[PDB]
Amino acid sequence: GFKQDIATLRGDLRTYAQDIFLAFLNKYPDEKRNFKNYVGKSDQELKSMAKFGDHTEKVFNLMMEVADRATDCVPLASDASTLVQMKQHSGLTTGNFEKLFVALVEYMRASGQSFDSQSWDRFGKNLVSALSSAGMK
Numbered sequence: 001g002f003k004q005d006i007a008t009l010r011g012d013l014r015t016y017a018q019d020i021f022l023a024f025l026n027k028y029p030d031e032k033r034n035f036k037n038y039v040g041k042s043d044q045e046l047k048s049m050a051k052f053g054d055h056t057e058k059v060f061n062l063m064m065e066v067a068d069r070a071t072d073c074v075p076l077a078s079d080a081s082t083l084v085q086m087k088q089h090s091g092l093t094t095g096n097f098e099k100l101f102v103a104l105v106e107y108m109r110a111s112g113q114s115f116d117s118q119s120w121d122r123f124g125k126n127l128v129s130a131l132s133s134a135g136m137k
């Protein structure tokens with residue numbers, strides 16, 4: 001289930017973080033509008049850029065903590081209030097996070113592993129709602 005998936009993702013987190021984030025940027029090319037430094041790069045080039053690997057892993061490091069602290073895929077309100085009070089996220093809509101989770105769920109559905117993709121879809125929805133309730137546009 002969801003909890004085991006957290007463990008699975010953590011056991012190879014740098015790879016999963018990069019592959020899922022690339023799936024997001026490739027499915028939603030306009031999202032590079034928030035990632036000016038990644039334009040005109042293939043997946044293999046992005047994987048060569050220090051901040052790409054370091055930032056994607058940090059994002060997923062914190063996403064897994066928020067998943068771990070959730071109950072029945074519902075994150076703590078403190079964790080959402082922390083995501084909202086992020087200066088790096090000042091120019092972000094809930095829609096950006098929604099798209100990242102659509103890509104994450106589709107990645108899990110396409111893998112041969114028994115990820116609980118429906119739980120991740122609920123988690124992404126519930127995190128968006130919690131971000132909106134904590135003040136994200």
Ligand SMILES: Oc1c(Cl)cc(Cl)cc1Cl
Pocket residue numbers: 021035051052053055056059
């Ligand atoms: O470089 C970044 C990456 Cl790869 C992902 C996110 Cl969500 C934010 C930043 Cl600044």
